[PDB]
Amino acid sequence: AVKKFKPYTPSRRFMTVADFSEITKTEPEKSLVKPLKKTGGRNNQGRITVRFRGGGHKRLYRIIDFKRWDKVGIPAKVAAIEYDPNRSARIALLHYVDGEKRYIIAPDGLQVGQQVVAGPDAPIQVGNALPLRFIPVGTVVHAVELEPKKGAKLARAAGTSAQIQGREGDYVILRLPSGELRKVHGECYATVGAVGNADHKNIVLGKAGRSRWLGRRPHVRGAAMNPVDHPHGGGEGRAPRGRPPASPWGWQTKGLKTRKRRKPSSRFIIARRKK
Amino acid sequence: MKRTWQPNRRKRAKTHGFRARMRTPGGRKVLKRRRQKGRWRLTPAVRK
RNA sequence: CCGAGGGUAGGGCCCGUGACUGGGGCGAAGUCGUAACAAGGUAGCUGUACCGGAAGGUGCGGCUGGAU
RNA sequence: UGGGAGAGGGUGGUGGAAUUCCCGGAGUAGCGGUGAAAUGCGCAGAUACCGGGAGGAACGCCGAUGGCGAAGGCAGCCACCUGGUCCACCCGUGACGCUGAGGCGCGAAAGCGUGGGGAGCAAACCGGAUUAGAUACCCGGGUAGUCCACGCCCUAAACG
RNA sequence: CGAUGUCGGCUCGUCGCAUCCUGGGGCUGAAGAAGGUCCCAAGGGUUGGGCUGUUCGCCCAUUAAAGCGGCACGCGAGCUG
RNA sequence: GAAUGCCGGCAUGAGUAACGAUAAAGAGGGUGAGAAUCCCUCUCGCCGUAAGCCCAAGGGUUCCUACGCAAUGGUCGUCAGCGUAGGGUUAGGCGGGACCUAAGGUGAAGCCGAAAGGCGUAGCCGAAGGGCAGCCGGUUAAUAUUCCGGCCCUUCCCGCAGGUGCGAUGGGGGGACGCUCUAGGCUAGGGGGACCGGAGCCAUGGACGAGCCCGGCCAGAAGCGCAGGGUGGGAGGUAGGCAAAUCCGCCUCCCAACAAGCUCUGCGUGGUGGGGAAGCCCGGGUGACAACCCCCCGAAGCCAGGGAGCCAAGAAAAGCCUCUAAGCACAACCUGCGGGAACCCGUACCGCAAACCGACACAGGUGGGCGGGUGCAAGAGCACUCAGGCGCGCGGGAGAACCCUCGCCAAGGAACUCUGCAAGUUGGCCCCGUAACUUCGGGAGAAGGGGUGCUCCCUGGGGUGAUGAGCCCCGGGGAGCCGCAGUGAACAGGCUCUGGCGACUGUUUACCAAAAACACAGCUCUCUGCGAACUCGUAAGAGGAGGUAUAGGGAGCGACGCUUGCCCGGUGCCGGAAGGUCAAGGGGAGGGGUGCAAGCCCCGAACCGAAGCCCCGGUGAACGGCGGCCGUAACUAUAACGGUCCUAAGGUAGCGAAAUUCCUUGUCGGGUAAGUUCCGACCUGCACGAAAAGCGUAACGACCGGAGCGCUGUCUCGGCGAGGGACCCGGUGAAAUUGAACUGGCCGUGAAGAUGCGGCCUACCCGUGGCAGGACGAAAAGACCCCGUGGAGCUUUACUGCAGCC
RNA sequence: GAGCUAGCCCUGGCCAGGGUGAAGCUGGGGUGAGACCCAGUGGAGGCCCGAACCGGUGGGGGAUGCAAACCCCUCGGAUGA
Numbered sequence A: 001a002v003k004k005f006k007p008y009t010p011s012r013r014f015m016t017v018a019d020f021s022e023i024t025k026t027e028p029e030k031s032l033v034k035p036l037k038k039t040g041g042r043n044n045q046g047r048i049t050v051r052f053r054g055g056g057h058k059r060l061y062r063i064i065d066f067k068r069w070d071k072v073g074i075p076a077k078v079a080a081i082e083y084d085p086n087r088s089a090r091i092a093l094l095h096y097v098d099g100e101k102r103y104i105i106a107p108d109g110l111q112v113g114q115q116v117v118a119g120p121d122a123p124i125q126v127g128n129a130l131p132l133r134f135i136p137v138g139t140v141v142h143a144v145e146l147e148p149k150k151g152a153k154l155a156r157a158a159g160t161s162a163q164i165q166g167r168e169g170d171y172v173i174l175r176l177p178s179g180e181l182r183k184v185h186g187e188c189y190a191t192v193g194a195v196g197n198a199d200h201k202n203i204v205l206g207k208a209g210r211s212r213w214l215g216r217r218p219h220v221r222g223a224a225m226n227p228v229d230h231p232h233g234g235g236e237g238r239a240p241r242g243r244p245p246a247s248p249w250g251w252q253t254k255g256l257k258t259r260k261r262r263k264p265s266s267r268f269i270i271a272r273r274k275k
Numbered sequence B: 001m002k003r004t005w006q007p008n009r010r011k012r013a014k015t016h017g018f019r020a021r022m023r024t025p026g027g028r029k030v031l032k033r034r035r036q037k038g039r040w041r042l043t044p045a046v047r048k
Numbered sequence C: 001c002c003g004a005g006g007g008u009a010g011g012g013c014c015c016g017u018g019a020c021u022g023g024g025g026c027g028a029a030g031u032c033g034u035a036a037c038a039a040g041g042u043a044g045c046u047g048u049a050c051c052g053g054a055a056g057g058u059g060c061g062g063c064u065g066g067a068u
Numbered sequence D: 001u002g003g004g005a006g007a008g009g010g011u012g013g014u015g016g017a018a019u020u021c022c023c024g025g026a027g028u029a030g031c032g033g034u035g036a037a038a039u040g041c042g043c044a045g046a047u048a049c050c051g052g053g054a055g056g057a058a059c060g061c062c063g064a065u066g067g068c069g070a071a072g073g074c075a076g077c078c079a080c081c082u083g084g085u086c087c088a089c090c091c092g093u094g095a096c097g098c099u100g101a102g103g104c105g106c107g108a109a110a111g112c113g114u115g116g117g118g119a120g121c122a123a124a125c126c127g128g129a130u131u132a133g134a135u136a137c138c139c140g141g142g143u144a145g146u147c148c149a150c151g152c153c154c155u156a157a158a159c160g
Numbered sequence E: 001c002g003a004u005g006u007c008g009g010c011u012c013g014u015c016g017c018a019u020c021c022u023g024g025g026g027c028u029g030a031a032g033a034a035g036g037u038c039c040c041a042a043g044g045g046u047u048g049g050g051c052u053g054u055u056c057g058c059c060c061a062u063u064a065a066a067g068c069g070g071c072a073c074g075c076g077a078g079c080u081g
Numbered sequence F: 001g002a003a004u005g006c007c008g009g010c011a012u013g014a015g016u017a018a019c020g021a022u023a024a025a026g027a028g029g030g031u032g033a034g035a036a037u038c039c040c041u042c043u044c045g046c047c048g049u050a051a052g053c054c055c056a057a058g059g060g061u062u063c064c065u066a067c068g069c070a071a072u073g074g075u076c077g078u079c080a081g082c083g084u085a086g087g088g089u090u091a092g093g094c095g096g097g098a099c100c101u102a103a104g105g106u107g108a109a110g111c112c113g114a115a116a117g118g119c120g121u122a123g124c125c126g127a128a129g130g131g132c133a134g135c136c137g138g139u140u141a142a143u144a145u146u147c148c149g150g151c152c153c154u155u156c157c158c159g160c161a162g163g164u165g166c167g168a169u170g171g172g173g174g175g176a177c178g179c180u181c182u183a184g185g186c187u188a189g190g191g192g193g194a195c196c197g198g199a200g201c202c203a204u205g206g207a208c209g210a211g212c213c214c215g216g217c218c219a220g221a222a223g224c225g226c227a228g229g230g231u232g233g234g235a236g237g238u239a240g241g242c243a244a245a246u247c248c249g250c251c252u253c254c255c256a257a258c259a260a261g262c263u264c265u266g267c268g269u270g271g272u273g274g275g276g277a278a279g280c281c282c283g284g285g286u287g288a289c290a291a292c293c294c295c296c297c298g299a300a301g302c303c304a305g306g307g308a309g310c311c312a313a314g315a316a317a318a319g320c321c322u323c324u325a326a327g328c329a330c331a332a333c334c335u336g337c338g339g340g341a342a343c344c345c346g347u348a349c350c351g352c353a354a355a356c357c358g359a360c361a362c363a364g365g366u367g368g369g370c371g372g373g374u375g376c377a378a379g380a381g382c383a384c385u386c387a388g389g390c391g392c393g394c395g396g397g398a399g400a401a402c403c404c405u406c407g408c409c410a411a412g413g414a415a416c417u418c419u420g421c422a423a424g425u426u427g428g429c430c431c432c433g434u435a436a437c438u439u440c441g442g443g444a445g446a447a448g449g450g451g452u453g454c455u456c457c458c459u460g461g462g463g464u465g466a467u468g469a470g471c472c473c474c475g476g477g478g479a480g481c482c483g484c485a486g487u488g489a490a491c492a493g494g495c496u497c498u499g500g501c502g503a504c505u506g507u508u509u510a511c512c513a514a515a516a517a518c519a520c521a522g523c524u525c526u527c528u529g530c531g532a533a534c535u536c537g538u539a540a541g542a543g544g545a546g547g548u549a550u551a552g553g554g555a556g557c558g559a560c561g562c563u564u565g566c567c568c569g570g571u572g573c574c575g576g577a578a579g580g581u582c583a584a585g586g587g588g589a590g591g592g593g594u595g596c597a598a599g600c601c602c603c604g605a606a607c608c609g610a611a612g613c614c615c616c617g618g619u620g621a622a623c624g625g626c627g628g629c630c631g632u633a634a635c636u637a638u639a640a641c642g643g644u645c646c647u648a649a650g651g652u653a654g655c656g657a658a659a660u661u662c663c664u665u666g667u668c669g670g671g672u673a674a675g676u677u678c679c680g681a682c683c684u685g686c687a688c689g690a691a692a693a694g695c696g697u698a699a700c701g702a703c704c705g706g707a708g709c710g711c712u713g714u715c716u717c718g719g720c721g722a723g724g725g726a727c728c729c730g731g732u733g734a735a736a737u738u739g740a741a742c743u744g745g746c747c748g749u750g751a752a753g754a755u756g757c758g759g760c761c762u763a764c765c766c767g768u769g770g771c772a773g774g775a776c777g778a779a780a781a782g783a784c785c786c787c788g789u790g791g792a793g794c795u796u797u798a799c800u801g802c803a804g805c806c
Numbered sequence G: 001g002a003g004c005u006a007g008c009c010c011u012g013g014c015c016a017g018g019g020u021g022a023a024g025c026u027g028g029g030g031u032g033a034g035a036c037c038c039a040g041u042g043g044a045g046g047c048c049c050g051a052a053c054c055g056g057u058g059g060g061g062g063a064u065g066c067a068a069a070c071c072c073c074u075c076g077g078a079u080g081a
Ligand SMILES: [K+]
Pocket: F784
């Protein structure tokens, strides 16, 4: 439940923050953090390759377990739910009976004190991870591997989920977060439940400083530039596009499909996305 | 006001020094040419 | 000291008035159409919403104060 | 105290019919629509038929001149939670009652905010007809909305 | 065009007269007073404000009068901008 | 002889501008050939969150001393950061290295690239970050945490003793972390004392005093005291920490839990070693057996890895502790003590500046620490002052114009002007009080006002302390005193109403624009299923992202409110397994060259044959576009209504003479004596209009309009005064410019604006201070304009290519 | 050539003093329970005033300068993009 503020500065009038109420531990597990190398959007040439990045708060990376099939049948206790600044979802700290400690992303409804488990025989419970073939059709599910043993790839952001819709040979049909209908192999693991912190989307950054705290530097409209800079640059006074709206690099940006045509995975996408 | 020359001994040796020149085709030509020209110093002096 | 009152400043209430503007009432024989009264020729009325020169029309839900 | 009837309310779940769309099959010259038509759809293979699937909304028969609620209103089925109510017995308290300016709560539809949902229907809007006109009636489309949650709105031929 | 800085304002003047006022006149459809019209006359004088960058113009309040032009549309090695 | 030619020399301007902050000088005495300028003394002024002191960077002998004055020094010079010479920088503990890792760089493995080379895991490099053992004083002309003294300490090597399963680049713990706020206890620092020590002093009317003036400490090992940080103990199980593991992790049980214990810092004390003022006398000697005590204020520093809250969620690696593996347990490690060993580089001096960056001894620029006192509500503000450092390397006069900075001004008060530009006004604190409107925060310091010094009396609370005295902090009342005036000096908003634009704080044309421009939360469209899209790269490889549709890219719009209409014919994009065209290729009807012929060779029709295009549809917060003429109502006028032509469709709501209105100063209303501006209206909108968004909107703005109050030298209309210059004298001494000049006025003439020609007029020779009309004055081979088959940036349905994509 | 300048990465440092007084917390009231109101506590914020520090609004000076962008007065930000 996003927390509002009283309008005692111009920016606090609309600013909302997360409530953080699901959080029970407030400093990470030392043995699971490592430094996140901030890039500024610069590749190994020093060149900006993603404009307007840099200058956000320092973060340590929490190592997350996106496999979960390294420890089939070994149950864990959910020890804490922690803030993770490297993702929208909250993370859940797991204590295995091994003694081994691991982070998964916190599904919605997961409660501190409960047990989760992974494997072909796991109960169908929020927190548990199975290969797709063993999860009953209809199940809402997240952190879905896209190819067997390659790691959880789909439905990881706050609030997202995939639904199992049917089966077909070695593959199951998923409705992905985007609406796309896609075959995913049955041996691919998924975790029962939707990703938590679904109120994330309703946060109102409130002021430009907040974007700056996240490493987002101001975005400059091509219409604010000169012709040397942008297709939309120039013109005395303000100016409409005066050509099909285009990117800095010339390509059209209203409707132009950009998925490579002859992509081998097209054989597996049933229906392109919705809405 | 703030002028353009802001001396810095480490910056001077690391940018124009002998070892920066030898690590690069262009810099080794800079050394080749200043030798042929008979320069008394091949490289800027910095006291280290 | 208080003190009629005078002066500086700021409020509140009422009355008059104002380019222009809003609809309202009324006015023997103007223009447009025909919404209602008969099943009034699409039963009417209705609260709301949207639209239209105008009456009105349409959607939703309601009423019979509707006919056959 | 013992019993009862009930679409009374809230939450969770869940069933079959039908529509639409999608996929496969089979098939070909029209389908659709009206007062009649036209627009529209269809040889790029529509309609009609079979199979598979997705999804939303409403629950046929029972069903009634029926039932429940203070009203607005409430109808597939299951469970949970919860209200009102009637009857019996004549057991308990001993007038503890009636109404009720204010206050407070509830309040059909439509509408509004933030999300979600969107099959069918359908303001607006587009087109085809009709007509002197037709910003209508009829026809083909079609967006809000209609549905969910939370928060507002507080209206009514909210009527007996 | 190997540069003659370009509007207006300010300052500072100076000149012409086709004279706005003051002086001298003739004619008058000049009773008087006030005017009209032309002639002579450049000695001096020719206001303060509102609007607009404005020149100009209109307006307000005066005045004997609120004149028109030249001087690189006088004057930026004088100022403004 | 010319090339705004080249190099050099020397002129002119000219004894002219200037001599570099307006913090400021005067005298006496020295020295010396020579003195405003060097030295000494006394007087005066300036800085004092520095204009003082200590670091770092940079500089590189400039440091100290003797001897010098040609040049350098904006004058002088005997002086100097100058010339010559000699001397000067001393570390196991400070800084860096023989330690660690950060970005990044490099790079065995490996990958890619015509060559050069580009990547790249580990590893290595890499510091102002981690880690690590020295404090106080003395001494030199010049170094000192370095030499000396006193007291402390670290590592390594060897030994002795005691102890133990010893052993690692491997496992684990720890190191190890943000912002804001902040408790307790200290210290640094500072105030006061009638207490202790001190050379002295009594002035000029008074004071021999509880008088004046001066000082009253610093370091310190073990121990102890105080304040804090860190940390549970035991046992059993064990599959995890890429071998092992008694470690750590996880489960269970028992004892302890604001604690205690153990441990580590800080502070106090502490054997001991130091220091020690004014004044007097000549850096030193005295003072001095110096004293070295008490009270108060008190950090932003310390205890610290403290506490709380919050969201944007806050390095790593070594040292260190523990665990074990090879091994080895005659070793080895831990502990205590002893002896020995302990290397390299820096160390001078300037360091907000005359030694650094600015060509200069240049009003500029330069990171960190200390930065005292009193008063002003506070403070690093402001005034004055301490310690300390300076008077800014030309001076002396004069007291013109004019310029600069400054002060005052009668009456008026914006009449100035494009504009109240500028300058006044206001001004801190306390109290009273405060409107429209609003998003309920605000508007608000609204506005407007009253108070403010000093004395005496009564009196309230708090801190320290003891619950008291004292010290210290926050107040309440009463009675009075003085002046023109009490934030008495310095520092310290003018205010209001009403429009436009942009919500807002931010950002920008370094050096003519700070804005209405950019950004911005937020809204929408669109792409993207992950080896994503997109971006850089030939590639490998990166970024995106160790992210995954509540995510990421691209685009427009720009908080918020109410909204965003109609057109898909053209262009774009999206969809369409049909049809039409369509390249290489497939096919080979049918030819042709040649050869005796088998053959060899060349052409080649139908037909099959992709993307693209055509074609069929969709699509506007895609590119874009959203009509004309004529007629019509019972006064007139005007047309709700009609006719017709055209369109893909004819602009809706809202707004409108506008940041848009040409005619225009439209018209009417308001404000004014007067209003081309302003405000409110009207609507024939030359030429608004709905995310190149439309109409609004509280708050906000060094934005741009209009008005009023207050107040003024802006002005009527100027006067006086101050200082720095200008001016005169001594010293030093430029500059652009310059065909040569013996260089007047008019009226003419002349290539059409003449000192230079003609006629006339006027005019003795040479300067100084001033003014700018001319020398078509200087400057810059006009930026405008044109010309050149000159160039460059940019655009596109110009041409032709290429990357990229199909 | 990024010792100027623009952006980013890593690691450090800096921001006197004063004002305003959000959430929360506690208590009181309120109710069936609530929302809610009130007081105290609290200490939020691209909050307010103002030095350092960062700026460069207006005017004046300067214009062969002290300076190839400076000086004086005035003005913006000053816990944050
Ligand atoms: K031009």
